[model samples]
Target: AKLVCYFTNWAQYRQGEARFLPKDLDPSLCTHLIYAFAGMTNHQLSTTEWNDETLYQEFNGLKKMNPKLKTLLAIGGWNFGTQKFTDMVATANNRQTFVNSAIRFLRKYSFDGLDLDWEYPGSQGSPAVDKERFTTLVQDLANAFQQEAQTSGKERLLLSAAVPAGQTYVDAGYEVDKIAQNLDFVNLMAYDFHGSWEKVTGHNSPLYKRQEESGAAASLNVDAAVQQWLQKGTPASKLILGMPTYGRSFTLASSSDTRVGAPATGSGTPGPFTKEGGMLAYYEVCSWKGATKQRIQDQKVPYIFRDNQWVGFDDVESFKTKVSYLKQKGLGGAMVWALDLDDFAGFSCNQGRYPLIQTLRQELSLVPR
Candidate 1:
């Protein structure tokens, strides 16, 4: 079980350590990396004409730094607004056309594989018009990609999808069981379970289910997500866990200083709109929690209570538990929501270091380079 991390090209840390990176981030630790986005627009911003420099530069640098490193481009993020997905998947010809476009994009970019972050199929937010055809579409893409790779004599590009771990989204026809057979791996978005949407304040994501009423079991951590998909026909070997580098926050009303899980709800300070509202990055939370009492609750959740604000985040202690959880579930590997949100030293690799990425290696019995 190795670790793969996320990097958003448009983020402040896009240039890596060569630019204004945190003081301590070293690039050699991660086994794999995935860039955040690439769109499906026409020629100009489309995949074919898109810049390969980013991939070349980053992967080249990564290989130079650590000879054994894998990187890939993630396509169709949550924000792409999949208005054309349904139309694109409606016909077999259309599906193949999209697959060719993806293959062309991968070849042009020199990518190792493709990660599909479609946000959802058979759901709203993006353009998933043909709700029932998602599994078929992925199958088509996989078959076409395989055919193209064999004909062109290039390595067959890997295919993965980022999916919601919640049952609601699963029931909406994500069809993990059907789609898993065609994909190389499935990345689970295990964060953002609790936020401003709920009347009661809770952590953004819980390693375990806090609300027993949600029909969630106690073993629900990153590994539990794997179990869910596995039960739905997804293999345990192709499952990758998602970690949130970013945190979520909520704002309580004025004069509401009541403690968390209290009868009266205390709001999240910054609310969900701003990063500082109540949410803090993993690095920030670790530093802050050192001075505070942040620990995993009996329900196997990690949350912090300071002043009137109650924020939940994944700490090293909880992460250690999660690593154990992953192994216990026999999961394939782990992934981070992103790398940029980490403090400079957050991704640094060292023998005794507990940075998220490093910790993952240790948990998996891997030695850091």
Candidate 2:
């Protein structure tokens, strides 16, 4: 079992605000830290800026604080697009080129491994054959890492992927059994189950399905998503469920229409810090005043509404339930989308710094109360 956390490099750019640096991390909180997103150019791995390599070093160097901490470089993200992935995995030569480049890039920067985050394989603009091609990429990387380890007399590099949560994405993008065999663990992005994209308000990540849900939406809950992966041949021991340290918001059509399925004109106002409309960090959500909070027992999620604003997100209480579920299901462990989004500084959410993360560690028995 492992407690893995994602650390975003771009968080440094938000300096003077809620910028999260490698130095700010509490390595004891996670067994591993994934530095998200390096880029690809013409099927070769590359860094976004000249200083990225330096940051990469600083990120890995955090192991000095907690020697057990392992670091991996996560390549490609939703913003990285899938065209390059389609091009890279189209043929054996392209796959080899990308794999070779990945090894070199990782070795040069001293990362312990690589994490492929293709956003998706069959969806988002990829070809129909992408489902199989995605398997090829993972298999090739697994084989390559083994060879590299044997030749160098060093430990084999860990290989993992950030996968989509919904069954539709899972069915479209993955050859589940084969992909699972090739990966050290598959990070199921269990959040984003619902967002402002829909005309109606909904939970960003519900542990169980709301009784009212039917049809496709019925399969969107965390319980159903995890069960789907397990039923599809993914080993529970290699599945790391994802947890969000943020919330999805909405602008109510009217102050009185504050229920879960209320109509909404659009997303909620952007956070003063995150500056993203329709999304608010846990810290921001915690600071919200005069809002009536409610819990959905069937879904096992919490939300709040006031005037014309509504938001759905996880809290310390919800996280406790999530961790308990993971333990009950015998899954590997939990993972956070990114370390930056939480109330990591304890400036807000007077409960404590990294309230959600702290709750996770305590719930998993990784830390003491």
Candidate 3:
């Protein structure tokens, strides 16, 4: 019903900090924290401050200050840019080494759990994923984590993952239901539902359903995302809906079409001549538009319009709608892409602004009967 905010490793570059977050941040809403993109090697980190010492040192302060929070480390991301995981999971000798390393990693960092964001499993950039092997890897990883926790006399280091939203992702990434049973929760990257990649511009994440001709396009909405997982046997209570604070845009010839309600002709990559508008950071957009109010279409999401740009994003209202839907779905809680995008000091969005982290916390903490 609420949110657990995740920040991938390159997260520091996006937020302008290394170990600690901006001093202006409001930490009351977050229930969990995920450090993103920690590879098997953990080398993406730039600042020495992020050395294992700092992760535990700094995060411990944050947790002590906010007793409700739990923190985990996440490995892999969209451009983690590596296929080495297959090598690690391919052989039992390597698998045991990886498992032992993970166990030591948790103990070394004093983290509460581990989250796998392996951009892919069954298939991805390299045509090398062993579909069955991916499932085996997760099963083994789960079993190891549980065993380690039991021997250590701890609740068991939690196991979780950030999964692909579409069914194709499900098919390629391994069996979600089977993995869900072993994980504390499963996160769905439910955003990026729309962008400037189609014929018309639409919201990046819509709460309702939208139909598409191609199998790839049909699963872009939230309803499709949830149903896909449910069909895969992932329990509703174990799934977490993802909400992004960013917005994707596109450019038209001359006139601005603010009501297209769908993506224009381009993909997340460049379009005919130029790269489609990149995902504008949350704070940057707020400064320019003051948290433009979003209106929902046939789908259960709300979008905002400014100038000739048909901007697609989530707002306080749309978030509330999804919160209600989560309640109805008997879901665990919600998730935010990165906390840095939220309103820090209420400068741009002001009172009308919806603090992404705060809203999710309120929604999730609601007592469940």
**Poorest lDDT segment (10 consecutive residues) of candidate 1:** 16-25
- Over the stretch 1-369, how does candidate 2's per-residue lDDT look in tens digits? 688899887777764548776567886888888988888998898897667888887887787777778889898999988899999999999999999999888888888899989988999998879999999999999999999999999888899999988877788989899999999998989999988998889999999887788999998889988998898888999999999999999998999888788898899999888888999989888878888899878988899988888999999899999999999999999999778888888878888778898888887788722
Q: Which ten-residue region of model 2 has the weakest summed lDDT?
A: 14-23
lDDT of each: 0.63, 0.88, 0.65
Q: lDDT of model 3 at residue 251?
A: 49
Q: Which ten residues in a row have the lowest lDDT in candidate 3?
A: 267-276
Expressed as tens digits, the lDDT of each residue in 52-102 for candidate 1 is 464446554665666677677777777675666666777777776677787
Cα lDDT tens digits, model 3, 1-369, are 436777543344432322224453334556677766466652222122356455455664577677766778877777664477777767787778777787787667767777887778766753445566667767887899888767878777877888878767678666766777888888878887667656677667877655443466666788788888878888998888888876666543323555644435442322121223545544445445443545555676655545445556666667777787778888878888876555544545554333665666566664322
Estimate TM-scores for all models.
Answer: 0.83, 0.97, 0.84
> Where does candidate 2 stray beyond 4 Å?
15-17
TM-score of model 2 vs. true structure? 0.97
Per-candidate clash tally: 7, 0, 16
Highest lDDT scorer: 2
- What is the alpha-carbon lDDT for the whole of candidate 1? 0.63
